[PDB]
Amino acid sequence: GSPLLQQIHNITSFIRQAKAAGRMDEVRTLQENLRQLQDEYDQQQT
């Protein structure tokens, strides 16, 4: 739970910063990293 949530918080922040700097490749790969970790977090709780 909580450690995974920390990772999720951090990738979410990195996506915000990458969008603000107009770095598209970085945004798209990080969005896929986030999507995979969010499913892992949800399944562990589900």
Side-chain angles (χ1 to χ4, degrees), residues 1-22 24 26-43 45:
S2 299
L4 263 174
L5 191 61
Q6 195 170 66
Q7 288 181 275
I8 287 166
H9 289 339
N10 291 338
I11 298 170
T12 302
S13 296
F14 296 141
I15 290 163
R16 187 179 319 111
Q17 289 187 110
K19 282 177 178 175
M24 179 165 284
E26 182 177 352
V27 170
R28 300 314 184 205
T29 62
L30 290 172
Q31 284 175 322
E32 179 64 6
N33 294 312
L34 180 61
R35 191 188 66 79
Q36 294 176 94
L37 286 191
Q38 188 67 60
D39 188 68
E40 178 175 357
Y41 178 84
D42 288 350
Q43 287 292 289
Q45 300 284 307

Short mmCIF file of all heavy atoms in Angstrom, two decimals, unseen atoms left out:
data_model
loop_
_atom_site.label_atom_id
_atom_site.label_comp_id
_atom_site.label_asym_id
_atom_site.label_seq_id
_atom_site.Cartn_x
_atom_site.Cartn_y
_atom_site.Cartn_z
N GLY A 1 0.81 -1.25 0.00
CA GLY A 1 0.00 0.00 0.00
C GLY A 1 0.82 1.28 0.00
O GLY A 1 1.09 1.84 -1.06
N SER A 2 1.22 1.73 1.19
CA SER A 2 1.80 3.06 1.38
C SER A 2 3.08 3.34 0.58
O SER A 2 3.22 4.42 0.03
CB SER A 2 2.03 3.34 2.87
OG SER A 2 0.81 3.31 3.58
N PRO A 3 4.02 2.37 0.54
CA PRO A 3 5.19 2.57 -0.33
C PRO A 3 4.84 2.75 -1.81
O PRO A 3 5.40 3.63 -2.48
CB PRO A 3 6.01 1.29 -0.11
CG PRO A 3 5.54 0.77 1.22
CD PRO A 3 4.10 1.10 1.28
N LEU A 4 3.93 1.92 -2.33
CA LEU A 4 3.45 2.05 -3.71
C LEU A 4 2.78 3.41 -3.94
O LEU A 4 2.94 4.02 -5.00
CB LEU A 4 2.45 0.93 -4.08
CG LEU A 4 2.96 -0.30 -4.84
CD1 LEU A 4 1.84 -1.33 -4.98
CD2 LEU A 4 3.49 0.09 -6.22
N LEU A 5 2.01 3.87 -2.96
CA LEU A 5 1.36 5.17 -3.06
C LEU A 5 2.38 6.31 -3.14
O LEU A 5 2.17 7.29 -3.85
CB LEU A 5 0.40 5.39 -1.87
CG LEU A 5 -0.54 6.60 -1.98
CD1 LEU A 5 -1.47 6.47 -3.19
CD2 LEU A 5 -1.35 6.73 -0.70
N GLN A 6 3.49 6.17 -2.42
CA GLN A 6 4.59 7.14 -2.49
C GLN A 6 5.15 7.22 -3.91
O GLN A 6 5.37 8.31 -4.45
CB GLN A 6 5.69 6.76 -1.50
CG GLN A 6 6.69 7.85 -1.22
CD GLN A 6 7.61 7.48 -0.06
OE1 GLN A 6 8.41 6.55 -0.16
NE2 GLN A 6 7.49 8.20 1.05
N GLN A 7 5.39 6.05 -4.51
CA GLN A 7 5.86 5.96 -5.90
C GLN A 7 4.88 6.62 -6.86
O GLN A 7 5.27 7.37 -7.75
CB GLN A 7 6.05 4.50 -6.33
CG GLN A 7 7.22 3.77 -5.72
CD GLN A 7 7.31 2.35 -6.25
OE1 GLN A 7 6.65 1.44 -5.75
NE2 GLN A 7 8.12 2.15 -7.29
N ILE A 8 3.59 6.33 -6.67
CA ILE A 8 2.52 6.93 -7.48
C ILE A 8 2.48 8.46 -7.33
O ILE A 8 2.36 9.17 -8.33
CB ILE A 8 1.15 6.28 -7.12
CG1 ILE A 8 1.10 4.86 -7.70
CG2 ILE A 8 -0.01 7.12 -7.63
CD1 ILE A 8 -0.02 3.99 -7.16
N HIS A 9 2.58 8.96 -6.10
CA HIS A 9 2.66 10.41 -5.86
C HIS A 9 3.81 11.03 -6.65
O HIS A 9 3.68 12.09 -7.26
CB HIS A 9 2.89 10.73 -4.37
CG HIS A 9 1.72 10.47 -3.48
ND1 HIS A 9 0.42 10.39 -3.94
CD2 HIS A 9 1.65 10.34 -2.13
CE1 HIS A 9 -0.39 10.17 -2.92
NE2 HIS A 9 0.33 10.15 -1.81
N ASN A 10 4.96 10.35 -6.62
CA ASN A 10 6.17 10.87 -7.26
C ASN A 10 6.08 10.87 -8.78
O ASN A 10 6.44 11.87 -9.40
CB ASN A 10 7.40 10.10 -6.78
CG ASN A 10 7.73 10.37 -5.33
OD1 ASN A 10 7.33 11.39 -4.77
ND2 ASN A 10 8.45 9.45 -4.69
N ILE A 11 5.60 9.79 -9.39
CA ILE A 11 5.45 9.76 -10.85
C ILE A 11 4.44 10.82 -11.29
O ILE A 11 4.63 11.49 -12.31
CB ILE A 11 5.05 8.36 -11.41
CG1 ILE A 11 6.14 7.33 -11.10
CG2 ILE A 11 4.84 8.42 -12.93
CD1 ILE A 11 5.73 5.88 -11.37
N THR A 12 3.37 10.98 -10.52
CA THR A 12 2.37 12.01 -10.81
C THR A 12 3.00 13.42 -10.83
O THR A 12 2.74 14.22 -11.74
CB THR A 12 1.20 11.93 -9.80
OG1 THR A 12 0.61 10.62 -9.85
CG2 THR A 12 0.13 12.97 -10.10
N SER A 13 3.85 13.71 -9.85
CA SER A 13 4.58 14.98 -9.81
C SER A 13 5.54 15.14 -10.99
O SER A 13 5.62 16.22 -11.58
CB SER A 13 5.36 15.12 -8.50
OG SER A 13 4.49 15.15 -7.39
N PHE A 14 6.25 14.08 -11.35
CA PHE A 14 7.17 14.13 -12.50
C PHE A 14 6.43 14.37 -13.82
O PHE A 14 6.94 15.05 -14.71
CB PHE A 14 8.01 12.84 -12.62
CG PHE A 14 8.95 12.59 -11.45
CD1 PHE A 14 9.14 11.30 -10.97
CD2 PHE A 14 9.66 13.63 -10.86
CE1 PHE A 14 10.00 11.05 -9.90
CE2 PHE A 14 10.52 13.38 -9.80
CZ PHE A 14 10.69 12.10 -9.32
N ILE A 15 5.24 13.80 -13.97
CA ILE A 15 4.41 14.06 -15.15
C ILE A 15 4.00 15.55 -15.22
O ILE A 15 4.05 16.16 -16.30
CB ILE A 15 3.15 13.14 -15.18
CG1 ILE A 15 3.56 11.70 -15.47
CG2 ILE A 15 2.15 13.61 -16.24
CD1 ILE A 15 2.51 10.66 -15.11
N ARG A 16 3.63 16.13 -14.09
CA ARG A 16 3.24 17.55 -14.04
C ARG A 16 4.41 18.44 -14.46
O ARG A 16 4.23 19.40 -15.22
CB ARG A 16 2.77 17.93 -12.63
CG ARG A 16 2.19 19.34 -12.51
CD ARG A 16 1.71 19.66 -11.09
NE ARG A 16 1.03 18.53 -10.46
CZ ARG A 16 1.49 17.81 -9.43
NH1 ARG A 16 2.66 18.09 -8.86
NH2 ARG A 16 0.76 16.81 -8.96
N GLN A 17 5.60 18.13 -13.97
CA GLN A 17 6.78 18.91 -14.30
C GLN A 17 7.18 18.75 -15.77
O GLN A 17 7.59 19.73 -16.42
CB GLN A 17 7.94 18.54 -13.38
CG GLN A 17 7.75 19.01 -11.96
CD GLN A 17 8.99 18.78 -11.13
OE1 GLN A 17 9.69 19.72 -10.74
NE2 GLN A 17 9.30 17.51 -10.88
N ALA A 18 7.07 17.53 -16.30
CA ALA A 18 7.42 17.24 -17.70
C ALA A 18 6.44 17.91 -18.68
O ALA A 18 6.85 18.39 -19.74
CB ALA A 18 7.48 15.73 -17.95
N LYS A 19 5.16 17.94 -18.33
CA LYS A 19 4.18 18.67 -19.13
C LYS A 19 4.50 20.17 -19.13
O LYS A 19 4.46 20.81 -20.19
CB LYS A 19 2.74 18.43 -18.63
CG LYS A 19 2.09 17.09 -19.03
CD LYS A 19 0.70 16.99 -18.38
CE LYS A 19 -0.07 15.72 -18.74
NZ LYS A 19 -1.36 15.65 -17.99
N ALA A 20 4.83 20.72 -17.96
CA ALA A 20 5.14 22.15 -17.83
C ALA A 20 6.36 22.57 -18.66
O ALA A 20 6.45 23.72 -19.09
CB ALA A 20 5.35 22.53 -16.36
N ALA A 21 7.29 21.63 -18.86
CA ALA A 21 8.49 21.86 -19.68
C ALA A 21 8.32 21.41 -21.14
O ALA A 21 9.26 21.50 -21.92
CB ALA A 21 9.68 21.14 -19.06
N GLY A 22 7.13 20.92 -21.50
CA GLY A 22 6.86 20.51 -22.88
C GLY A 22 7.67 19.32 -23.36
O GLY A 22 8.11 19.30 -24.51
N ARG A 23 7.87 18.34 -22.49
CA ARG A 23 8.68 17.15 -22.82
C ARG A 23 7.77 15.94 -23.07
O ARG A 23 7.50 15.16 -22.15
CB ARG A 23 9.67 16.85 -21.69
N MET A 24 7.33 15.78 -24.32
CA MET A 24 6.25 14.84 -24.66
C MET A 24 6.63 13.36 -24.51
O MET A 24 5.85 12.58 -23.96
CB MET A 24 5.70 15.12 -26.07
CG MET A 24 4.58 14.17 -26.51
SD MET A 24 3.66 14.73 -27.96
CE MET A 24 2.64 16.01 -27.21
N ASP A 25 7.81 12.97 -25.01
CA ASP A 25 8.23 11.57 -24.91
C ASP A 25 8.26 11.13 -23.45
O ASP A 25 7.77 10.04 -23.11
CB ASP A 25 9.59 11.36 -25.57
N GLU A 26 8.83 11.98 -22.59
CA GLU A 26 8.92 11.73 -21.15
C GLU A 26 7.53 11.62 -20.52
O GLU A 26 7.26 10.72 -19.72
CB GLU A 26 9.71 12.84 -20.45
CG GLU A 26 9.90 12.64 -18.95
CD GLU A 26 10.75 13.72 -18.28
OE1 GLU A 26 11.34 14.57 -18.99
OE2 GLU A 26 10.82 13.73 -17.03
N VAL A 27 6.64 12.53 -20.88
CA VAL A 27 5.26 12.47 -20.39
C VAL A 27 4.61 11.13 -20.74
O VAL A 27 4.01 10.50 -19.86
CB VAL A 27 4.39 13.64 -20.92
CG1 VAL A 27 2.92 13.42 -20.60
CG2 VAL A 27 4.88 14.98 -20.34
N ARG A 28 4.71 10.68 -21.99
CA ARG A 28 4.01 9.45 -22.41
C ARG A 28 4.57 8.17 -21.77
O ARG A 28 3.79 7.29 -21.39
CB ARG A 28 3.98 9.29 -23.94
CG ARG A 28 3.28 10.42 -24.72
CD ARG A 28 1.91 10.82 -24.12
NE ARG A 28 1.24 11.83 -24.94
CZ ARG A 28 0.33 12.69 -24.48
NH1 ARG A 28 -0.03 12.70 -23.20
NH2 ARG A 28 -0.22 13.56 -25.31
N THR A 29 5.89 8.06 -21.64
CA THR A 29 6.45 6.88 -20.99
C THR A 29 6.12 6.86 -19.49
O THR A 29 5.75 5.81 -18.96
CB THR A 29 7.97 6.71 -21.21
OG1 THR A 29 8.68 7.82 -20.65
CG2 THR A 29 8.28 6.57 -22.70
N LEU A 30 6.24 8.02 -18.82
CA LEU A 30 5.84 8.12 -17.40
C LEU A 30 4.35 7.83 -17.18
O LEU A 30 3.98 7.23 -16.17
CB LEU A 30 6.20 9.50 -16.81
CG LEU A 30 7.68 9.83 -16.60
CD1 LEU A 30 7.85 11.29 -16.20
CD2 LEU A 30 8.29 8.91 -15.57
N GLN A 31 3.49 8.26 -18.10
CA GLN A 31 2.06 7.95 -17.98
C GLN A 31 1.80 6.44 -18.02
O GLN A 31 0.92 5.94 -17.31
CB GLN A 31 1.22 8.67 -19.04
CG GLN A 31 1.02 10.16 -18.73
CD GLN A 31 0.31 10.92 -19.83
OE1 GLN A 31 0.52 10.66 -21.02
NE2 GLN A 31 -0.55 11.86 -19.44
N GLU A 32 2.57 5.71 -18.82
CA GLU A 32 2.46 4.25 -18.87
C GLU A 32 3.02 3.59 -17.60
O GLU A 32 2.45 2.62 -17.11
CB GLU A 32 3.13 3.70 -20.15
CG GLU A 32 3.11 2.18 -20.32
CD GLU A 32 1.71 1.58 -20.48
OE1 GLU A 32 0.71 2.33 -20.57
OE2 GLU A 32 1.62 0.33 -20.52
N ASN A 33 4.12 4.12 -17.06
CA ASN A 33 4.63 3.66 -15.77
C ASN A 33 3.60 3.81 -14.66
O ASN A 33 3.38 2.90 -13.86
CB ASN A 33 5.90 4.42 -15.35
CG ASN A 33 7.09 4.17 -16.26
OD1 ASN A 33 7.42 3.03 -16.60
ND2 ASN A 33 7.76 5.25 -16.64
N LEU A 34 2.98 4.99 -14.60
CA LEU A 34 1.93 5.30 -13.62
C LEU A 34 0.75 4.34 -13.76
O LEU A 34 0.26 3.81 -12.75
CB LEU A 34 1.44 6.75 -13.79
CG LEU A 34 0.33 7.23 -12.84
CD1 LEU A 34 0.81 7.17 -11.40
CD2 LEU A 34 -0.12 8.65 -13.20
N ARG A 35 0.29 4.11 -14.99
CA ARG A 35 -0.87 3.25 -15.25
C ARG A 35 -0.65 1.84 -14.71
O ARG A 35 -1.52 1.25 -14.06
CB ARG A 35 -1.19 3.20 -16.75
CG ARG A 35 -2.52 2.55 -17.10
CD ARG A 35 -2.70 2.36 -18.60
NE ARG A 35 -1.74 1.40 -19.16
CZ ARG A 35 -1.84 0.08 -19.07
NH1 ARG A 35 -2.88 -0.49 -18.47
NH2 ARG A 35 -0.91 -0.70 -19.61
N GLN A 36 0.54 1.30 -14.96
CA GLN A 36 0.90 -0.04 -14.48
C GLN A 36 0.97 -0.11 -12.95
O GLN A 36 0.45 -1.06 -12.36
CB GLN A 36 2.22 -0.51 -15.12
CG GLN A 36 2.13 -0.72 -16.63
CD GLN A 36 3.46 -1.09 -17.25
OE1 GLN A 36 3.77 -2.27 -17.42
NE2 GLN A 36 4.26 -0.08 -17.57
N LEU A 37 1.58 0.89 -12.31
CA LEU A 37 1.69 0.90 -10.84
C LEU A 37 0.34 1.11 -10.17
O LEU A 37 0.09 0.54 -9.10
CB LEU A 37 2.68 1.97 -10.34
CG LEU A 37 4.17 1.70 -10.52
CD1 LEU A 37 4.97 2.73 -9.74
CD2 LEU A 37 4.56 0.29 -10.09
N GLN A 38 -0.53 1.91 -10.78
CA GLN A 38 -1.86 2.13 -10.22
C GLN A 38 -2.68 0.84 -10.22
O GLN A 38 -3.41 0.58 -9.27
CB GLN A 38 -2.61 3.25 -10.96
CG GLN A 38 -3.94 3.65 -10.30
CD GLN A 38 -3.74 4.32 -8.95
OE1 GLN A 38 -3.10 5.37 -8.85
NE2 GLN A 38 -4.29 3.72 -7.90
N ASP A 39 -2.55 0.03 -11.27
CA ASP A 39 -3.26 -1.25 -11.30
C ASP A 39 -2.73 -2.19 -10.21
O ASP A 39 -3.51 -2.88 -9.55
CB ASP A 39 -3.17 -1.94 -12.66
CG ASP A 39 -4.07 -3.17 -12.75
OD1 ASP A 39 -5.31 -2.99 -12.74
OD2 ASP A 39 -3.53 -4.30 -12.78
N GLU A 40 -1.41 -2.22 -10.03
CA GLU A 40 -0.82 -3.02 -8.96
C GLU A 40 -1.34 -2.60 -7.58
O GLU A 40 -1.68 -3.45 -6.75
CB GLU A 40 0.71 -2.97 -8.98
CG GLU A 40 1.32 -3.77 -7.83
CD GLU A 40 2.82 -3.85 -7.85
OE1 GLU A 40 3.45 -3.32 -8.81
OE2 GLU A 40 3.38 -4.44 -6.90
N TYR A 41 -1.41 -1.29 -7.34
CA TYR A 41 -1.92 -0.76 -6.07
C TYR A 41 -3.39 -1.14 -5.87
O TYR A 41 -3.78 -1.61 -4.79
CB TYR A 41 -1.74 0.77 -6.01
CG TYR A 41 -2.28 1.43 -4.74
CD1 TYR A 41 -1.51 1.49 -3.58
CD2 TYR A 41 -3.55 1.99 -4.72
CE1 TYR A 41 -2.00 2.10 -2.42
CE2 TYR A 41 -4.04 2.61 -3.56
CZ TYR A 41 -3.26 2.66 -2.42
OH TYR A 41 -3.75 3.26 -1.28
N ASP A 42 -4.21 -0.95 -6.90
CA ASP A 42 -5.64 -1.24 -6.83
C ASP A 42 -5.91 -2.73 -6.58
O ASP A 42 -6.77 -3.08 -5.77
CB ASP A 42 -6.38 -0.77 -8.10
CG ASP A 42 -6.49 0.74 -8.20
OD1 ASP A 42 -6.18 1.45 -7.22
OD2 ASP A 42 -6.92 1.22 -9.27
N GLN A 43 -5.17 -3.60 -7.27
CA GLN A 43 -5.35 -5.04 -7.13
C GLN A 43 -4.97 -5.53 -5.72
O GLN A 43 -5.65 -6.41 -5.17
CB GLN A 43 -4.57 -5.81 -8.21
CG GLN A 43 -5.19 -5.72 -9.60
CD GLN A 43 -6.53 -6.45 -9.70
OE1 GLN A 43 -6.57 -7.67 -9.68
NE2 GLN A 43 -7.61 -5.69 -9.82
N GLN A 44 -3.92 -4.96 -5.15
CA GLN A 44 -3.51 -5.30 -3.78
C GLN A 44 -4.57 -4.90 -2.75
O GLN A 44 -4.71 -5.55 -1.71
CB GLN A 44 -2.17 -4.65 -3.45
N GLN A 45 -5.32 -3.83 -3.04
CA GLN A 45 -6.41 -3.37 -2.17
C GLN A 45 -7.72 -4.08 -2.49
O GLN A 45 -8.57 -4.23 -1.61
CB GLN A 45 -6.60 -1.85 -2.32
CG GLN A 45 -5.38 -1.02 -1.95
CD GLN A 45 -5.17 -0.90 -0.45
OE1 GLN A 45 -6.08 -0.51 0.29
NE2 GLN A 45 -3.97 -1.21 0.01
N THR A 46 -7.89 -4.51 -3.74
CA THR A 46 -9.11 -5.17 -4.20
C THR A 46 -9.14 -6.64 -3.80
O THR A 46 -8.73 -7.00 -2.70
CB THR A 46 -9.24 -5.03 -5.72
#
